[PDB]
Amino acid sequence: SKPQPIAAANWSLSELIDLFNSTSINHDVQCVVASTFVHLAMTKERLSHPKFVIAAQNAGNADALASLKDFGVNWIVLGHSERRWYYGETNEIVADKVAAAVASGFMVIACIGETLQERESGRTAVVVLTQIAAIAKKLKKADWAKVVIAYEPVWAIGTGKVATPQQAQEAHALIRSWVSSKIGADVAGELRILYGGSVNGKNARTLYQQRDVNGFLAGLKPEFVDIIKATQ
C-alpha cells in the first residue's frame, strides 16, 4: 500500500490554530505546521493536536539547528521555491542544509521542482532529478528514514494553476523510480513524496488518488483542514 501520508502547511494565526485543535482526524496522517522563527514559540504553546508537529523553515546554521532541537522542534522544511529562485540557494546549498538537519536529529521535508520555463522546454525530468541527486549525494542510505520529498512546480506555487493529476503523478513516479534505482527499492517504497502548488480540498482529493502521491504541502490557511481530509 502507501506509506503514512503527510499534510504540511508552510508558513489570524490564533483562529487558525483553534480550528486545527478542534478538528477530529479519523485516519492515519502526519500533520505538520511550519512557521518562521518569530512564530514558533506561540505555535508550540498553542497547537496541541497530537497528530500535528511543528516545523522550522530554512535554518542552515549548526547552532541554530541545535537550538531548535533543544526547543523541541523536530521537523524542518528546506529548499522551498523562493529559497532557490529568489534567495539563490543552489542545489548544493539545499543539500548541505538537508544533511545538516538530518545530522541534528530532524525529520526533513526537502522541496524540489522545476520552473515555468523548465517545464515548457521539456526539462522537468533533468532538473528535478539533478536537484534530488544533489540531496542524495550528501546523505547515506539510513538517512532516508528522516527524509520527505515535496515536489512543487514553481509555476504552480501561488499562481492558482495546479498540476493536473497526470502531471503530478508523472513527476512523483519519476522521482520514486530514481530513488529506487539509485538509493534502493526499500527506501523508495517508504519514501513520502508530497505534492505542492495551488492545492485546495477538491483538487487535493483527486490528486491523492494517484499512485505515487503521499500527501501535500500547502499554505497555512483555513482550507488546510480539507487538504488533511483529502489524504485518504
Curated annotation (Swiss-Prot):
It catalyses: D-glyceraldehyde 3-phosphate = dihydroxyacetone phosphate. The active site is at 80 (electrophile), 152 (proton acceptor). Keywords: Gluconeogenesis, Glycolysis, Glycosome, Isomerase, Peroxisome. Signal peptide: none annotated. Its main location: other. CDD domains: TIM. Belongs to the triosephosphate isomerase family. The enzyme contains a high proportion of positively-charged residues in beta-barrels V and VII (compared to the homologous regions in other triose isomerase sequences). Since 2 clusters of positive charges located at precise distances on the molecular surface are common to 4 glycosomal enzymes, it has been speculated that this might represent a signal for entry into glycosomes. This is Triosephosphate isomerase, glycosomal.
